Amino acid sequence: SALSDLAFFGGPAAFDQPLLVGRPNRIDRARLYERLDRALDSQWLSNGGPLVREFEERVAGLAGVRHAVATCNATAGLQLLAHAAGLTGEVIMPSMTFAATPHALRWIGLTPVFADIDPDTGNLDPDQVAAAVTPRTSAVVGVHLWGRPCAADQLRKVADEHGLRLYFDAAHALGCAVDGRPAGSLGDAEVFSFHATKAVNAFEGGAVVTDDADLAARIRALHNFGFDLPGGSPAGGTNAKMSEAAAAMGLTSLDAFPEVIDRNRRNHAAYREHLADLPGVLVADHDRHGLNNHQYVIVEIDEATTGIHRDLVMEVLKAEGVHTRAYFSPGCHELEPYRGQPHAPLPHTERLAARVLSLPTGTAIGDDDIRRVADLLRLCATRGRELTARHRD
Amino acid sequence: ALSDLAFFGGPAAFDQPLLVGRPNRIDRARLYERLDRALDSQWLSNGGPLVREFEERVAGLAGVRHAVATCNATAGLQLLAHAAGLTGEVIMPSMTFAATPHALRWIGLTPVFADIDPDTGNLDPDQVAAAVTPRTSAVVGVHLWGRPCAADQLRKVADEHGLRLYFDAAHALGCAVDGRPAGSLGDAEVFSFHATKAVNAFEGGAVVTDDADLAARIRALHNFGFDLPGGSPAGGTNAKMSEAAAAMGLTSLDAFPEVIDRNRRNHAAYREHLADLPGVLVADHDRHGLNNHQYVIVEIDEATTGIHRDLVMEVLKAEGVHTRAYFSPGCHELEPYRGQPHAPLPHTERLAARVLSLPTGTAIGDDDIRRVADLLRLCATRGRELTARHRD
Numbered sequence: 129s130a131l132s133d134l135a136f137f138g139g140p141a142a143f144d145q146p147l148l149v150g151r152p153n154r155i156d157r158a159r160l161y162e163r164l165d166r167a168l169d170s171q172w173l174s175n176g177g178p179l180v181r182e183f184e185e186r187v188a189g190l191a192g193v194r195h196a197v198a199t200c201n202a203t204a205g206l207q208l209l210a211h212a213a214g215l216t217g218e219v220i221m222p223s224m225t226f227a228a229t230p231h232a233l234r235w236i237g238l239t240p241v242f243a244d245i246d247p248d249t250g251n252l253d254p255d256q257v258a259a260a261v262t263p264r265t266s267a268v269v270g271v272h273l274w275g276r277p278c279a280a281d282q283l284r285k286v287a288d289e290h291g292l293r294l295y296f297d298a299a300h301a302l303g304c305a306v307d308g309r310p311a312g313s314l315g316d317a318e319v320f321s322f323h324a325t326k327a328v329n330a331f332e333g334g335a336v337v338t339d340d341a342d343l344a345a346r347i348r349a350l351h352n353f354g355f356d357l358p359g360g361s362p363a364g365g366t367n368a369k370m371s372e373a374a375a376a377m378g379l380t381s382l383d384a385f386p387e388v389i390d391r392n393r394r395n396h397a398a399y400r401e402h403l404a405d406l407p408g409v410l411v412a413d414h415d416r417h418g419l420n421n422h423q424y425v426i427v428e429i430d431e432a433t434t435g436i437h438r439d440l441v442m443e444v445l446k447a448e449g450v451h452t453r454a455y456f457s458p459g460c461h462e463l464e465p466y467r468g469q470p471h472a473p474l475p476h477t478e479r480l481a482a483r484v485l486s487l488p489t490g491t492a493i494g495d496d497d498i499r500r501v502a503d504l505l506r507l508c509a510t511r512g513r514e515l516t517a518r519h520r521d
Numbered sequence: 522a523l524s525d526l527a528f529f530g531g532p533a534a535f536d537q538p539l540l541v542g543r544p545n546r547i548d549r550a551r552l553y554e555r556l557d558r559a560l561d562s563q564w565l566s567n568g569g570p571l572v573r574e575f576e577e578r579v580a581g582l583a584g585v586r587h588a589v590a591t592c593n594a595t596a597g598l599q600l601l602a603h604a605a606g607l608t609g610e611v612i613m614p615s616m617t618f619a620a621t622p623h624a625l626r627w628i629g630l631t632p633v634f635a636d637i638d639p640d641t642g643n644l645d646p647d648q649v650a651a652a653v654t655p656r657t658s659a660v661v662g663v664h665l666w667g668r669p670c671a672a673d674q675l676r677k678v679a680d681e682h683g684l685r686l687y688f689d690a691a692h693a694l695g696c697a698v699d700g701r702p703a704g705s706l707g708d709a710e711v712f713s714f715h716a717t718k719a720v721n722a723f724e725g726g727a728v729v730t731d732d733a734d735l736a737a738r739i740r741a742l743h744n745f746g747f748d749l750p751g752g753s754p755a756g757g758t759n760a761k762m763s764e765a766a767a768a769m770g771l772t773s774l775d776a777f778p779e780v781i782d783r784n785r786r787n788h789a790a791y792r793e794h795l796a797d798l799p800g801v802l803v804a805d806h807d808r809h810g811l812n813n814h815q816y817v818i819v820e821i822d823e824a825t826t827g828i829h830r831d832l833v834m835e836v837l838k839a840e841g842v843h844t845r846a847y848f849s850p851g852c853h854e855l856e857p858y859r860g861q862p863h864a865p866l867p868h869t870e871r872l873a874a875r876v877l878s879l880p881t882g883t884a885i886g887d888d889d890i891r892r893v894a895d896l897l898r899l900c901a902t903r904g905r906e907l908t909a910r911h912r913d
């Protein structure tokens with residue numbers, strides 16, 4: 129049995145070099161330090177300095193909008209948006225997303241309201257929205273899943289119908305577009321993320337982008353103790369400021385972006401090719417949905433076809449030093465404190481959540497690495513039944 | 522002559538601007554070494570080693586077992602509130618930076634303001650019980666300018682009303698009273714490591730406590746509530762400190778003891794250079810217990826000097842001396858609190874209208890102290906004339 133050579137089965141782990149989904153993409157150290165030197169020299173370290181402003185600029189350009197406010201992280205970005213907009217009560221959003229989408233709002237007292245995805249896209253289904261609306265609904269927050277843009281036009285249409293605002297969690301969408309429109313320019317306002325793990329990172333950081341100047345001014349003021357906000361806000365304000373240092377990392381990362389995308393695309397094609405003709409394993413075709421950054425390599429594992437559940441596949445690879453993640457599983461509607469509360473039906477969400485597996489990518493991964501993983505996946509898929517059986521023992 | 526004051530058209534007194542809040546320089550080499558190691562490892566956030574070491578150093582300095590490093594002190598308070606399960610009302614001073622009440626308002630809590638002990642500037646424990654209500658969940662004091670709060674007495678009160686006691690220890694790192702370090706005084710305390718503090722991490726803060734459970738709850742919630750068996754009604758958020766911030770903070774802590782010493786020296790120089798100056802009173806923090814002296818504060822008595830705190834600021838400002846009123850006015854006069862109903866806060870108001878923060882830190886030398894002082898001495902000796910000429 130080739131299964132016994134499986135470290136998972138107590139065999140020897142095939143390789144010494146660990147592969148990790150999320151590995152930050154390398155940068156030009158020299159460029160970063162200059163940037164840091166310059167800020168240290170000026171003694172201007174935070175509170176709206178020149179690096180942040182520069183970043184905000186590039187960021188907004190990329191979104192195809194006029195304004196951007198740089199933040200400490202995207203989650204805080206969601207909170208400012210909500211507060212700045214005076215959102216109240218319920219917010220309709222997919223359950224198929226990272227915990228931060230609902231939690232960000234729940235943290236500041238809002239009520240996430242979960243609606244199903246369009247199984248063909250993985251994004252919030254506009255046709256499921258209306259049924260979720262109530263006297264308490266203030267808005268709709270869609271998620272460009274894996275960078276695929278939502279059906280904003282349709283979503284917008286429903287929104288309108290119920291006198292609701294329309295925003296997007298564009299955490300994964302930097303550099304993505306649909307029908308030539310870039311993500312960040314589709315909602316009333318959108319939130320980007322610059323976490324260490326994204327295509328573009330600033331250690332920790334985010335940005336709220338919008339074409340709405342007034343809205344933009346409120347967010348800016350609220351992110352700075354509510355200072356300089358005529359009339360203030362019932363929320364008061366907070367600290368969600370991006371320091372010059374993060375902006376330094378942020379700009380240097382934006383610099384590498386073009387090449388990161390390229391590698392991402394290449395890595396993607398590579399996986400596609402290495403996993404070709406493998407029943408029950410499918411490489412997610414992000415391209416079908418518009419221009420994608422390819423920061424996420426996702427496959428769906430069909431347990432019926434393969435005879436092995438995604439989870440087990442995960443474990444098997446982890447044992448081999450290949451760290452994958454299930455982005456996302458389960459749906460947020462199954463996480464605390466949502467877990468067990470009444471929710472609209474979410475069969476599409478639940479089904480996808482159980483099949484998804486994210487594989488290592490970015491500048492840290494090359495062909496050889498790819499093959500090693502594809503090969504491991506191919507083994508699992510073609511010998512699932514026996515692998516599961518042997519595990520079952 | 523006043524005609525000379527750059528504020529009266531005259532030429533600006535010195536060219537090298539002095540800034541309250543200028544960050545103390547650091548050992549860049551030690552900084553870059555740290556950054557390099559983080560970059561190399563490819564571990565940039567999410568509880569990295571620098572962050573862990575920092576938390577360890579910070580907790581030791583606070584005189585407690587645990588510390589959770591955050592993206593900022595404001596978020597620190599929010600994690601603390603939610604982790605704690607606070608609800609409804611929270612009693613705190615109005616004599617503080619906006620962030621104390623705002624931090625809480627932001628997450629839907631109601632700040633309840635109480636007056637300060639005019640003789641300290643800290644939440645007067647007396648005034649506390651009066652503000653209690655059935656909505657009241659906790660008491661949050663502010664170690665004003667590093668000055669340790671009368672914690673014990675406050676605890677008593679808290680205890681009697683079944684409340685919780687926490688402190689916004691934003692400026693209290695390394696301050697102490699009767700040998701007890703700021704950070705070990707309340708149920709938990711929050712420090713700030715903003716670029717402008719004694720200890721800088723660009724942006725950052727930390728929640729310290731001896732309460733291991735609280736500590737773990739704080740930790741889980743700062744990371745989207747992950748690994749919090751049972752979760753929380755708040756859900757969770759992201760308030761993590763990156764390894765980059767940690768690198769800076771460690772470097773900053775490396776130089777802290779020396780900073781304090783310099784600060785201490787600075788204060789003495791200002792004290793001496795400002796003697797025999799009625800209505801211009803150098804705040805003696807030390808009387809409140811050991812202080813790190815990051816804040817050089819003077820009270821301007823308008824009736825005595827014949828010149829208002831504000832105009833003095835303006836005058837100094839024109840001379841290249843950038844000062845700040847820490848804090849003016851009281852939070853109660855701040856939106857959204859403003860206009861809404863509060864207890865009487867005469868002490869807060871009095872104090873708020875007099876305070877003035879002077880430049881200090883490693884960049885401030887004796888010579889500079891002289892220049893500021895000679896500048897203040899003039900305003901306070903010719904308040905009348907100056908004030909009046911202005912008003913033309």
Ligand SMILES: Cc1ncc(COP(=O)(O)O)c(/C=N/[C@H]2[C@H](O)[C@@H](O)[C@@H](OP(=O)(O)OP(=O)(O)OC[C@H]3O[C@@H](n4cc(C)c(=O)[nH]c4=O)C[C@@H]3O)O[C@@H]2C)c1O
Binds near residue numbers: 148152229299451
């Ligand atoms: C839809 C959506 N909305 C909102 C947000 C919130 O935006 P932010 O507030 O974070 O700016 C996110 C975040 N989405 C991101 C999270 O930011 C990231 O922490 C990770 O959520 P975790 O999986 O819990 O992080 P972690 O388990 O510590 O690391 C994940 C993988 O990355 C690797 N890694 C991680 C870091 C930090 C590193 O420095 N190096 C590294 O190799 C280790 C591991 O294999 O991925 C999510 C999809 C999101 O996906």
Ligand SMILES: Cc1ncc(COP(=O)(O)O)c(/C=N/[C@H]2[C@H](O)[C@@H](O)[C@@H](OP(=O)(O)OP(=O)(O)OC[C@H]3O[C@@H](n4cc(C)c(=O)[nH]c4=O)C[C@@H]3O)O[C@@H]2C)c1O
Binds near residue numbers: 172174544663
């Ligand atoms: C009692 C209390 N609780 C809680 C907090 C919240 O801690 P954090 O969430 O920020 O970690 C604070 C913060 N207290 C600090 C604030 O952190 C700081 O922004 C500054 O509040 P601002 O005056 O509104 O920021 P800014 O006007 O840009 O700084 C004023 C002075 O600092 C100088 N400066 C500032 C920066 C950012 C710099 O990089 N270099 C520099 O020289 C310029 C100027 O003379 O001082 C406050 C008392 C606090 O005092």
